[PDB]
């Protein structure tokens, strides 16, 4: 099959910057009829892909002229000028000249923005969950940038590793931040044996760990 | 005004088959080839095959030969894809995508296929209220635990002008999904004004509310 190799895998870009995405094919995409069926698609988080460019350099209806496609033969480039926050997503090149038609692996466009410290909130298990025999302690770390963040859990000051699950959102097109949940799941009896629960975040915005805690004895 | 409406998501057992549809509107169905594309979670797009609705001609990616069968019904302006001998590898979003000189100018919204022996299970919904302040905002949440298959939608009855919501992607945990959602509202409004999360799990046809209590 014709292999479509995209670079870079991830592309951070500031608002108003220009982004350049490379697509190289393992063999010429010029069809015998002279056309080059090289296309570019954008898939925004949670949405279907959308056509941007066809036949190398032609913009589909409604695609603004800051998207430009160039190249020939086996080497192609998508340039996104005057980047806007809503441009974030995964860009794919595609060739239809040879069966089977094949896609590049994708380039994830990330918006660069100023550092933003997470707003951290911690929640005890609900009485409803406790009646069921379980106990989830939840920390929300909301609206932060950059994405890299490490969460450490402590119970009565001791580090707790087992039972932790972490989930990041995709980047938000409105403010270019990330959010994430960190959840510690214990049994009811285990939860009720201890006093303080702490989620501790290491992030670029703080020289020290960002700490959030509750104590079952403060009610 | 071209629209491609695909059929709903389906949970199916390994070894079974499933047939999904793609209903075209806003143009002459026979005028344009219809493609089908697979996207496994977190992976790239793959071209499955193409059908000419005018005459039923087909062309397949040999990777899906004997896996996917493409058909159309002209009278109903509908394209179909049937997948057989399902395995976990067949769990994916499947798109129909219509030709327009370009290969995929219009896309359906996708059909999520889950191949699993696990049974449909509605979620438990738990309120996340702060523990035991002086600040001007308060963040609340709902934990949506132990459901299958995906997905769920969490909504909040907070004031749109004065609140902000985050939806966290679900993770698998002991064969079941768990997700959460947070909402932030002005502290002057809570607990005086009720805050409730509504959780919809279409696969079990459940719509459950949980009131947030201090």
């Amino acid at each position: 099959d014709v292999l479509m190799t995209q670079t870079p895998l991830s592309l951070p870009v500031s608002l108003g910057d220009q982004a350049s995405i490379s697509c190289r094919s393992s063999q010429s995409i010029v069809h015998s009829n002279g056309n080059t069926y090289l296309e570019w698609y954008l898939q925004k988080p949670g949405q279907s892909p959308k056509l941007l460019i066809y036949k190398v350099s032609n913009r589909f209806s409604g695609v603004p002229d800051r998207f430009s496609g160039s190249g020939s033969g086996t080497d192609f480039t998508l340039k996104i000028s005057r980047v806007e926050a809503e441009d974030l997503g995964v860009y794919y090149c595609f060739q239809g000249s040879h069966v089977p038609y094949t896609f590049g692996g994708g380039t994830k466009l990330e918006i660069k923005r100023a550092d933003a410290a997470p707003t951290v909130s911690i929640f005890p298990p609900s009485s409803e969950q406790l009646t069921s025999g379980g106990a989830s302690v939840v920390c929300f770390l909301n609206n932060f940038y950059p994405k890299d963040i490490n969460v450490k859990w402590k119970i009565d000051g001791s580090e707790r590793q087992n039972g932790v699950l972490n989930s990041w959102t995709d980047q938000d097109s409105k403010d270019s931040t990330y959010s994430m949940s960190s959840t510690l799941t214990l049994t009811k009896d285990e939860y009720e044996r201890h006093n303080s629960y702490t989620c501790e975040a290491t992030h670029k915005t703080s020289t020290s760990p960002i700490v959030k805690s509750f104590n079952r004895n403060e009610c | 005004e071209v629209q491609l409406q695909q059929s709903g998501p389906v949970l199916v057992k390994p070894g079974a088959s499933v047939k999904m549809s793609c209903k075209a509107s806003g143009y002459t169905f026979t005028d344009y080839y219809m493609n089908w594309v697979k996207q496994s979670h977190g992976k790239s797009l793959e071209w499955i095959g193409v059908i000419n609705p005018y005459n039923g001609d087909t062309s397949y990616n040999q990777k899906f030969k004997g896996k996917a069968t493409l058909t159309v019904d002209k009278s109903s302006s509908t394209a179909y894809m049937e997948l057989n001998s399902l395995t976990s590898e067949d769990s994916a979003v499947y798109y129909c995508a219509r030709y327009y000189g370009s290969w995929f100018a219009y896309w359906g919204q996708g059909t999520l296929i889950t191949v699993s022996t696990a049974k449909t299970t509605p979620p438990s919904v738990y309120p996340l209220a702060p523990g035991c302040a002086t600040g001007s905002s308060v963040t609340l949440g709902c934990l949506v635990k132990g459901y299958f298959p995906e997905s769920v939608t969490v909504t909040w009855n907070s004031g749109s002008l004065s609140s902000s919501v985050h939806t966290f992607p679900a993770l698998l945990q002991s064969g079941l999904y768990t997700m959460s959602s947070s909402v932030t509202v002005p502290s002057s409004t809570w607990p005086s004004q009720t805050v409730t999360c509504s959780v919809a799990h279409p696969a079990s046809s459940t719509t459950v509310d949980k009131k947030l209590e201090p």
Binding site: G96, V99 | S59, Q62
Partner: peptide, 10 residues
């Protein structure tokens, strides 16, 4: 294999 979209017939 024959490119149905380009050739129109295979």
């Amino acid at each position: 294999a024959c490119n149905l979209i380009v050739e129109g017939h295979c």
